[PDB]
């Protein structure tokens with residue numbers, strides 16, 4: 057006897073059901089109804105003629121067609137939402153309650169644990185629960201000492217106790233009806249507003265987050281020690297995985313590797329690396345999920361490893377490495393961590409001790425340690441889905457307390473798994489509150505500097521906007537953090553059930569235009585690399601040999617590939633200009649077009665932003681092939697690793713010198729490889745190695761785990777086994793040196809970092825365009841106040857003009873730019889002192905404004921004011 061849920065209880069007095077041209081509601085407290093009988097109460101619903109109110113349809117657009125039914129006043133709603141409910145016609149079905157729950161029980165009062173000099177109080181939102189109690193434990197594994205009943209007041213359960221409650225461990229015992237089991241079950245659950253947990257979150261630790269003993273030395277002075285940030289336009293991002301950082305770092309003692317503590321090792325190879333990029337100009341470091349997620353056991357004694365020495369003896373293109381890693385993947389210390397369980401607590405496995413304060417203290421110490429070397433900290437936040445749901449499981453918490461509320465459901469009442477599994481419903485009040493609250497927890501209690509939203513397109517826009525004002529209004533005097541400096545960005549993908557605003561206006565790329573919130577520019581990524589993560593891996597792009605260097609894979613005639621190369625070049629140039637929708641570019645057809653007037657391969661605007669700070673330019677990230685791996689797959693095999701080394705630099709240089717916000721994947725600068733693994737979320741330390749000795753880049757360490765790569769093994773094997781694909785220390789260091797220099801160039805002039813669209817439209821121009829453009833060359837010019845009586849403000853005191861030439865051709869080129877004739881252009885001082893002998897041969901001839909640039913080279917020219 058388990059009916060689905062095709063009816064909706066949207067308001068205290070309205071029920072929406074999509075029946076056709078006698079409807080009754082049934083309620084059983086003990087959940088004993090069967091096919092309609094065994095009910096405790098019965099009431100008939102009067103068909104509404106005015107239909108659903110605008111508030112309902114605007115909150116739940118996908119049911120604006122449903123028929124409306126009115127619930128009598130005699131009906132006690134608060135009591136019914138606790139019982140089992142169905143509805144029948146004269147077809148039977150259950151009810152989805154989020155609507156009415158919000159209508160009647162929307163709560164803004166204290167949640168979780170509150171502390172006073174005299175007492176401690178607990179608060180839990182569970183409007184459907186029939187009873188809530190708290191079990192107290194004395195330790196992480198001790199027996200239950202005491203059980204205390206909580207009183208419900210407006211769907212919120214509370215209780216107050218002596219201050220001796222502090223430091224106790226506890227769990228809620230919730231008595232709720234679960235739709236998936238059609239039973240009233242008594243489950244144990246952690247606190248959604250937990251601030252700390254025992255190992256694996258088995259219990260909640262009743263700790264005071266403001267306790268002085270949880271603060272590193274000088275913690276309250278961190279606001280004063282934070283790296284300065286004049287504008288969001290100055291931001292550069294470096295995406296790093298906490299374990300990847302030190303797992304293989306021999307300079308950090310064995311025990312302290314792989315977690316938060318490793319960052320306290322100032323003089324380690326890894327930290328010296330971050331310090332080097334920081335001194336170069338890198339502002340922000342984006343850490344992969346560091347909250348409480350499933351997939352990694354917090355108990356280190358349970359961890360298992362592979363024989364790193366044995367696997368090192370296997371052949372480069374063997375399948376033995378992955379078979380060994382896969383064999384223990386479910387029990388190793390590794391995982392990206394995209395499996396949310398509790399959002400407001402640091403991951404136990406990254407702490408020195410899962411039980412106690414170490415996870416709190418060490419996290420702060422990590423934030424402080426990164427701030428002290430000039431780096432602000434960004435958290436990878438995943439509010440779009442949950443690891444688990446239902447009554448059973450240590451990894452299920454939210455859906456255990458208020459079943460069917462925190463998770464998004466289809467029209468049949470079944471849970472949506474679009475995001476991965478157990479999609480969240482940010483469109484629900486208390487879900488929205490939980491998200492904004494969690495953000496404030498990290499910004500204030502941990503002094504985090506920014507947030508990257510995973511699957512931002514699955515989050516309501518209003519949630520994103522309400523969070524943005526709450527975070528940016530934080531002040532040093534009231535909170536100890538400067539909220540105005542906090543930056544937000546995320547994946548604005550629009551797909552599945554949230555597409556076309558079906559669940560309301562979501563945080564997609566097009567909806568976030570003009571919000572000041574950044575989104576990943578997938579347009580410039582695909583144009584540079586070629587194709588897309590869903591297409592043929594051999595599809596070539598602007599920076600991977602399209603037309604100029606065919607790889608063998610058939611992609612049309614010379615005329616077609618040449619045309620496509622030009623098309624990609626247009627998208628890249630729009631992205632270089634901040635990916636603005638109103639920026640006017642001379643397209644390859646010769647016709648002038650705005651960024652929004654140029655369309656993607658599937659018919660949507662390439663440029664879609666209203667500001668440069670809304671675009672996150674990139675060519676690589678944690679997911680999909682690494683930069684080095686994608687280049688080694690798409691370019692012709694005949695190419696040497698020496699030439700590919702330059703191809704890598706071209707890619708990251710295009711990001712480092714583009715308007716908007718450059719985003720770098722940890723390893724780009726050192727040719728990092730995952731041996732061509734396209735989804736290394738679960739591939740262990742072996743395939744995710746970050747070698748800071750610079751001896752290797754992890755290329756040719758066997759084929760990648762078959763689960764996600766087996767269908768491309770034939771393509772990888774020959775390349776992995778080919779010794780001429782493997783870079784040596786020399787190459788890696790060279791890559792790192794030239795990467796550093798490019799950062800220095802971005803921060804040597806404010807012209808690379810224009811703050812508004814108006815400024816970009818006025819100063820940024822491209823000089824190699826039209827139907828007769830030289831293939832494989834991009835010439836970007838940036839103007840500043842020149843001569844007397846300028847229509848601009850002098851933004852740069854050193855240069856009055858800046859020209860950048862991107863040459864992806866194998867051969868040297870000479871670009872005649874008459875507009876820039878008879879000027880004082882010199883090779884950038886940083887490139888004149890470059891260790892790359894090639895770029896130093898860049899020249900400029902005044903009489904014709906000719907710029908001579910070597911092949912596979914990016915050359916920056918400037919015009920001194922002095």
Ligand SMILES: OC[C@H]1O[C@@H]2O[C@H]3[C@H](O)[C@@H](O)[C@@H](O[C@H]4[C@H](O)[C@@H](O)[C@@H](O[C@H]5[C@H](O)[C@@H](O)[C@@H](O[C@H]6[C@H](O)[C@@H](O)[C@@H](O[C@H]7[C@H](O)[C@@H](O)[C@@H](O[C@H]1[C@H](O)[C@H]2O)O[C@@H]7CO)O[C@@H]6CO)O[C@@H]5CO)O[C@@H]4CO)O[C@@H]3CO
Pocket residue numbers: 549550551578588589590658679680735
């Ligand atoms: O979602 C299922 C998907 O999950 C995983 O994919 C990741 C992926 O690794 C990430 O890179 C990212 O993808 C982003 C893209 O970065 C972004 O460009 C955009 O993609 C758009 C594409 O540009 C466009 O081509 C189109 O994609 C279509 C596509 O034509 C179809 O082939 C089909 O794709 C399916 C795949 O073929 C299939 O393998 C599987 O993919 C998994 C995958 O296993 C995993 O790595 O399912 C998909 C979906 O059915 O359909 C799509 C969409 O109709 O349109 C997209 C979006 O407008 O956005 C994506 C995110 O969707 O994130 C995904 C998911 O986290």
Ligand SMILES: [Ca+2]
Pocket residue numbers: 283333334335337338339429430431
């Ligand atoms: Ca810095």
Ligand SMILES: [Ca+2]
Pocket residue numbers: 351385386387388389390391738739740
């Ligand atoms: Ca794993």
